[PDB]
Amino acid sequence: TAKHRPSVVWLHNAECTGCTEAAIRTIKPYIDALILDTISLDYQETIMAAAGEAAEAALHQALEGKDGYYLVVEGGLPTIDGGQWGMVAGHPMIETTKKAAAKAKGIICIGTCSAYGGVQKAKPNPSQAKGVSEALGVKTINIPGCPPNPINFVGAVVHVLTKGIPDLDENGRPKLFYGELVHDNCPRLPHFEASEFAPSFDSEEAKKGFCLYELGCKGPVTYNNCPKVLFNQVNWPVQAGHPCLGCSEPDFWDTMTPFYEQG
Template sequence: MKPESIGLGLPAQTLGEHLRTRGMTRRSLLQYAACTASLMGLSPREAAAMAQGLEKATRQSVIWLSFQECTGCTESLTRSFSPSLEDLIFDFISLDYHHTLQAVSGEAAEAARHAAMKTHAGKYIVVVDGSVPLGEGGIYSVIAGMTNAAMLAETVEHAAAVIAVGTCAAYGGLPEARPNPTGAVPIAQLVKGKPVVNIPGCPPMPQAMAGTLTHFLSFGKLPELDALGRPKAFFGETIHDRCYRRPYYNRGQFAKGFDDEGARRGWCLYELGCKGPVTYNACASLKWNGGTSFPIQSGHGCIGCSEPRFWDRGGIYQPLPAPTKKRGRVIGIAAAGGTVLGAGAAVIARQRAGQTGSTEPTQE
């Protein structure tokens, strides 16, 4: 088998034609587009445009790089249910390189990566999970004889866009936490001249990953991003905005311990360190494992894992500023604090990018 054919298999037919050969009707495609568009806050007209774009597109070549990470981001992707992981890989995209999911290894795996880069130059998407260690010349993480930094630079050179999934890739995450012994940095600090989308979370939500890929495949551009490079559709509101325990907060009913009467009644976990008011993510509305639950519903406060440097901001169970009778004002102060921290992180990211000659995340 020639290296150029390893790991590829992109059909010459359009995605619509390919889906029909697998038994997916146009109605099913419209339903999927409507569901995805709804998740991303798009109008019915845009949902129809998404379906039309999907039908005319070809399967998207995706190269997935895994650096300093725990495989939790891939585990999250495998929990994707609309579309499922199987549908996503076999119908919507061509996952041409992925350490955990690919069948080949060694030289054959690297041949697949290079073949995808050559065949789809300027069109493929690079998904990265994990931070990149720069300390000691990058020796803390090496793949196929290459440092993470070298493999990233080589792979993104001819990419159409880069998606940093998980907090480690988006912000540096746990590896970058003080004292950061490996010199870990986020992906956006190293990527030059390419649009970068951050999908943070420890792990990130599968809907956010699948939705971002679908948007790019449908419209040929990235979704609208916030100041931290996150898709606004999934990171436009705080956990607190959508939390079903919000009424208890408004009434001043707070659990004092994880096993007290208030906790058993489902009262607000604010005083137990919940970071929902300053954390932007869609956990409370989309939930996890097919919409089954999310951490707060399971009885544990939000730890703020989709925000920059959440490991270094103090104890997970350390409460935010104590609520008062003017609870709306307290939430406003907390949210403003989160906004300021986020804006500060964005400024730092831009300064770092300037120091390394890279560009900040952009979108069309």
């Protein structure tokens, strides 16, 4: 029988691989079911068997597939010195991503780095790292956060494959996951409203679970679904007593710092 699951090519540029790691924390479905039954994951450096020229051949076979493919991009694009500070198989990352983007059925940027540039773009940006859209002038479906919840990434992939392009906000993020502020769903909101704040991490107020706004919490300016869905089915940063860093916002490394202040 002639069979085909939609081809996904996943590229790693200037990244920490935390987005790949987040993706494999999915439980609806688990990652094995996704790659056995739903997609054909045709290039993925972190987990693929082929290496070297065999891996590069697998990439080319996927990019030339007659059925087309979806492109997932993890990491920013380092552009300084002709793109040479980030290379795979002797090719600048920006060159390979440009080529893959040009024929992709759709482009999903997993993480703040591919969506907006991320940690390596933070001032003074030694490698002149750029987000994918910033570098290439192409529209992308952005699944940001550092890393995003697998619920948001796998949810977006499944949506793209079964329903179409989900409604995106002005930062390219699906409203399904990014339509609400972290703060608006935070269980510490009743403390915030009552101006009940922890003045320090050692304080009795912190022990009592008071709001973390005075300690820098960016929940009020950050669009994500963290308190609603949790991470790892168990926790999220504020529940663990720590302020939100704003990690799903563009350029947060520069716009949300200092992290323990309200700048």
